Design a protein around this ligand. Structure first.
Ligand SMILES: OC[C@H]1O[C@H](O[C@H]2[C@H](O)[C@@H](O)[C@@H](O[C@H]3[C@H](O)[C@@H](O)[C@@H](O[C@H]4[C@H](O)[C@@H](O)[C@H](O)O[C@@H]4CO)O[C@@H]3CO)O[C@@H]2CO)[C@H](O)[C@@H](O)[C@@H]1O
Ligand SMILES: OC[C@H]1O[C@H](O[C@H]2[C@H](O)[C@@H](O)[C@H](O[C@H]3[C@H](O)[C@@H](O)[C@H](O)O[C@@H]3CO)O[C@@H]2CO)[C@H](O)[C@@H](O)[C@@H]1O
Ligand SMILES: OC[C@H]1O[C@H](O)[C@H](O)[C@@H](O)[C@@H]1O
Ligand SMILES: *C(=O)[C@@H]1CCC(=O)N1
Ligand SMILES: [Ca+2]
Ligand SMILES: [Cl-]
Length: 495
């Protein structure tokens, strides 16, 4: 349940589709000094090379083998990345796709990221190796062999998720091959795993697989360290399978979080920020110590999975920064920040027909992440983690770590504020009029740099300044027209 991040680091960033060499560099030049706790990488195992559409992002969720050979790099580069990141105190979490192999209708051949041969029709994946009796063909009871009804917990676990060849996780052999892959990653130095499609696996089979895992690499982690486990389970209520069914194995993705936040911030369905004062379990969310929270993830930012129209993304930058800001400032759950790439989003009727488009590339070769002089990224990498408003809130969360949610204020609409003990205070204005009031910050007297509009550098603030009096009060003024209608100050942004 523990992140195993370096003491004082409270967030991980999803460097979606980034190359191992770019992540290695990013850890050293940026994540370490900016206090990021770790990085969730895209599946590092060999996958199907899909040509139609052309190299979609989702081809990485169709395993061919467990060789660490993908468009992100080979094993040497993978090991290089993990070592360089651990050496500067930044952890690596692997997106483990262990519920299945490839689409059952994909053509046989060597169209894979490492050239391994595979035959879906004959359930043949010699590079692992897996054969027909390593899949749930005989176990699934649906007419199509695919998952057709989510109200039936059994088919959800024994049948094919959109046709993906379902592994027989009950078999000790399959469990062992998977554990072999995971231990390979653990011994290399990875601190944990995002268990992909966990809802589709029996909690008892997952447990069995974890039983075979090693302790974390003792060169970097203390003896007896168990790998961090967060299972992807989309549970918005209404279905028989509940997130709580996986608490025994580790943490669980809380998809209700971003869905709710998104509609509050958009002020949809009669909601407003003032309702957020009992945010967390007060809203029906799982226990804070089991929740892996986020505003958006790689699936719902592009209409996949379960997001809905309220999900906020870099596309809605202004409201997105506010949402991520609120999350990072609130004590509930363990926070994951999304880092995406841009694609030609083109809505037709209700759907983005370019939701398949993979990462920036030149004929299949992923483009490197260029860093512009102003520290933003080029080559279409959005790099939300480098946006000042988000990067500074990541540090904000580190600074107030452990402090209690306190000093809440609200105007009964969309102008709220709250503090974290005596270490941080944040103010939001999401009403269509000006927010100007003197508030109790619970902070020691002094001059603080607003970390949203600017930074603190060698004695001065580059943005807005807030003055806290001897009684902890400070005046705040946020126009409903402000570029970023929220302000944040903390112990370490103080002059
Ligand atoms: O030897 C040539 C073949 O090599 C590869 O075969 C591998 C299988 O694909 C893979 O599943 C695994 O096989 C083990 C079974 O998964 C495991 O359940 C058990 O099998 C039992 C079986 O359940 C039982 O009914 C049977 O009668 O006895 C088995 C034990 O002998 O152990 C299996 C063997 O370890 O490993 C296989 C060998 O690597 C290729 O996939 C295949 O195409 C080749 O023909
Ligand atoms: O609780 C008693 C009843 O349990 C049994 O129902 C079982 C199914 O038989 C069993 O297959 C299923 O659990 C397994 C998956 O089927 C399996 O392949 C995999 O290894 O993990 C699952 C659990 O880890 O679960 C149901 C419910 O327990 C049994 O069939 C009934 O007769 C018993 O009365
Ligand atoms: O590229 C970085 C920039 O991206 C978006 O425009 C954000 O809204 C802005 O705050 C950020 O500085
Ligand atoms: C938590 O993420 C890990 C897996 C469960 C445990 O004890 N540690
Ligand atoms: Ca399954
Ligand atoms: Cl996820």
């Amino acid at each position: 349940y523990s992140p195993n991040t370096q003491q004082g680091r409270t967030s991980i960033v999803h460097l979606f589709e980034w190359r191992w060499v770019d992540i290695a560099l990013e850890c050293e030049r940026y994540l370490a000094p900016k206090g990021f706790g770790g990085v969730q990488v895209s599946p590092p195992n060999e996958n199907v090379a899909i040509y139609n559409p052309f190299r979609p992002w989702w081809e990485r969720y169709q395993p061919v083998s467990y060789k660490l050979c993908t468009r992100s790099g080979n094993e040497d580069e993978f090991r290089n990345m993990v070592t360089r990141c651990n050496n500067v105190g930044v952890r690596i979490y692997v997106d483990a796709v262990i519920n299945h192999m490839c689409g059952n209708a994909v053509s046989a051949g060597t169209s894979s990221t490492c050239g391994s041969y595979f035959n879906p029709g004959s359930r043949d994946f010699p590079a692992v190796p897996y054969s027909g009796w390593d899949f749930n063909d005989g176990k699934c009871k649906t007419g199509s062999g695919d998952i057709e009804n989510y109200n039936d917990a059994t088919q959800v676990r024994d049948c094919r998720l959109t046709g993906l060849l379902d592994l027989a996780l009950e078999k000790d052999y399959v469990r062992s091959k998977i554990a072999e892959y995971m231990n390979h990653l653990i011994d290399i130095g990875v601190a944990g795993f995002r268990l992909d499609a966990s809802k589709h696996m029996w909690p008892g089979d997952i447990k069995a697989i974890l039983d075979k895992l090693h302790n974390l690499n003792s060169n970097w982690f203390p003896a007896g360290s168990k790998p961090f486990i967060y299972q992807e389970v989309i549970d918005l209520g209404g279905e028989p399978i509940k997130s709580s069914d996986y608490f025994g194995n580790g943490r669980v993705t809380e998809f209700k979080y971003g869905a709710k936040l998104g509609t509050v911030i958009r002020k949809w369905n009669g909601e407003k920020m003032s309702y957020l004062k009992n945010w967390g379990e007060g809203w029906g969310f799982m226990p804070s110590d089991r929740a892996l929270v986020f505003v958006d993830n790689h699936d719902n930012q592009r209409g996949h999975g379960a997001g809905g129209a309220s999900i906020l993304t870099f596309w809605d930058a202004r409201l997105y920064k506010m949402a991520v800001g609120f999350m990072l400032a609130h004590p509930y759950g363990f926070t994951r920040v999304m880092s995406s790439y841009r694609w030609p989003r083109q809505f037709q009727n209700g759907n983005d027909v370019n939701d398949w488009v993979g990462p920036p590339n030149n004929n299949g070769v992923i483009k490197e992440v260029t860093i512009n002089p102003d520290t933003t990224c080029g080559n279409d990498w959005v790099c939300e983690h480098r946006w000042r408003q988000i990067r500074n809130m990541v540090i904000f969360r580190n600074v107030v770590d452990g402090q209690p949610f306190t000093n809440w204020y609200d105007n009964g609409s969309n102008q709220v504020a709250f503090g974290r003990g005596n270490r941080g205070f944040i103010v939001f204005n999401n009403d269509d009029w000006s927010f100007s009031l003197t508030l109790q910050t619970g902070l020691p007297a002094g001059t603080y740099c607003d970390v949203i509009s600017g930074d603190k550098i060698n004695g001065n603030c580059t943005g807005i300044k807030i003055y806290v009096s001897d009684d902890g009060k400070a005046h705040f003024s946020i126009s409903n027209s402000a570029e970023d209608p929220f302000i944040a100050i903390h112990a370490e942004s103080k002059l």
